Nucleic acid binder design. Structure first.
Ligand SMILES: Cc1cn([C@H]2C[C@H](O)[C@@H](COP(=O)(O)OP(=O)(O)OP(=O)(O)O)O2)c(=O)[nH]c1=O
Ligand SMILES: [Mg+2]
Ligand SMILES: [Mg+2]
Ligand SMILES: [Mg+2]
Ligand code: NA
Length: 383
DNA sequence: AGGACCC
DNA sequence: TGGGGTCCT
């Protein structure tokens, strides 16, 4: 019961989409801008020292000939992201999305159908496609090695189909679980693929420098670990199960330690259609107030249309806000409510604006002036 | 309703 | 002053 998982990772996704629309950008160094930020940039601009989530000024002062395009509206990038998933879904139905530009696919069944199709005389013609992690030697008598190679071939067909059908280039990694597949897809980039043979799993896991580099250990947990004297993957492999549990809870503790040995038994889940649809807008305390109402019509108008196209219906609405000052209490507030059934299905705007407005007043004292740096609307709980 | 994680 | 997502408590 050993698995063959692939993880697909598109290079500089937003920038790829922009370069495809307007090829006059193909060669100019390029950055996708949202508010005062460069969210992502193309491979030219990385050479020139530009980095993700570097502010627009710094970015000019590191490459003054940087061409900027606004990527605040995600429609185009969202659309392409589902084209990619659907294409992978043709290979094996069971595809898991992670943000807009990553997918996992469980290739185990396909690897097996393909192996059954070969007889014993070509089981030695099976070769690898792309890189072998750490240059490890292949052993054709090892069935795990054989399965992973067929994996690497299926991964190659997926990358070729993505390029031929949608114009997108990307990396893939093939491995025995999601964690390893994701760690190894990054080893050669851009636009290349790597396969991880089992013997090299400790080599891979120990190549990391910071324990935050393990998917599943975020900002909070890292920071908690560092303060316990846990810095390397090895520190975490070797630390007291007992003290860790007590510091994180048998859940978080027992899972991140398993992760630390490269062990990860989570299955690849079919993502299908989204569980929620939301729109945001950020500002430098640029709302107080009434203007909130306008801002909230905008998001709403855009969403209604997205939720119409889908043709499932939301049965809950949520309104999210954030308050001014500063490096302090920067956690957010929200208020949700069921959407009246009469409404579930022109003119839908007006009633909606009002629910939203009521939700708004529940949160903000609209007498003593307000400090708003974010407005968000979410539709969810659909069927 | 908030909090962790992911891109 | 990114703009989205997922699942758990
Ligand atoms: C990590 C991250 C990505 N993104 C966006 C930008 C990216 O186009 C997309 C996926 O990000 P990544 O896959 O992390 O990076 P990338 O795809 O832009 O470039 P590459 O993978 O070749 O390094 O999602 C954010 O908006 N915020 C984030 O914190
Ligand atoms: Mg990517
Ligand atoms: Mg995706
Ligand atoms: Mg991490
Ligand atoms: Na490979």
């Amino acid at each position: 019961s050993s698995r063959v998982i692939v993880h697909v990772d598109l290079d500089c996704f937003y920038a790829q989409v922009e370069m495809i629309s307007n090829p006059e950008l193909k060669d100019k160094p390029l950055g996708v801008q949202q508010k005062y930020l460069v969210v992502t940039c193309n491979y030219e601009a990385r050479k020139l020292g530009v980095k993700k989530l570097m502010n627009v000024r710094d970015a000019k002062e590191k490459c003054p000939q940087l061409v900027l395009v606004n990527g605040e509206d995600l429609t185009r990038y969202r659309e392409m992201s589902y084209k990619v998933t659907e294409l992978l879904e043709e290979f094996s139905p069971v595809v898991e999305r992670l943000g807009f530009d990553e997918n996992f696919v469980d290739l185990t069944e396909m690897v097996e159908k393909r192996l059954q199709q070969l007889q014993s005389d070509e089981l030695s013609a099976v070769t690898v496609s792309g890189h072998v992690y750490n240059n490890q030697s292949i052993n054709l008598l090892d069935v795990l090695h054989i399965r992973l190679l067929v994996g690497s071939q299926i991964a190659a067909e997926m990358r070729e189909a993505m390029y031929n059908q949608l114009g997108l280039t990307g990396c893939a990694g093939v491995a025995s679980n999601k964690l390893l597949a994701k760690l190894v897809s990054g080893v050669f980039k851009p636009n290349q693929q790597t396969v991880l043979l089992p013997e090299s799993c400790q080599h891979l896991i120990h190549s990391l420098n910071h324990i935050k580099e393990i998917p599943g250990i975020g900002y909070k947990t890292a920071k908690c670990l560092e303060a316990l004297g846990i810095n390397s993957v090895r520190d975490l492999q070797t630390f007291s199960p007992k003290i860790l549990e007590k510091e994180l809870g048998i859940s978080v503790a027992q899972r991140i330690q398993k992760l630390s040995f490269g062990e990860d038994n989570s299955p690849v889940i079919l993502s299908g259609p989204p569980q929620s649809f939301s729109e945001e807008d950020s500002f430098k305390k640029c709302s107080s107030e009434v203007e909130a109402k306008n801002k909230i019509e905008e998001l709403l108008a855009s969403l209604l249309n997205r939720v119409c196209q889908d043709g499932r219906k939301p049965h809950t609405v949520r309104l999210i806000i954030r308050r001014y000052s500063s490096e302090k209490h920067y956690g957010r507030e929200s208020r949700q409510c069921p959407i009246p059934s009469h409404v579930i299905q022109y003119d839908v705007m007006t009633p909606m604006v009002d629910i939203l407005m009521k939700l708004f007043r529940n949160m903000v004292n609209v007498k003593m002036p307000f400090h708003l740096t974010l407005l968000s609307v979410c539709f969810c709980n659909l069927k």
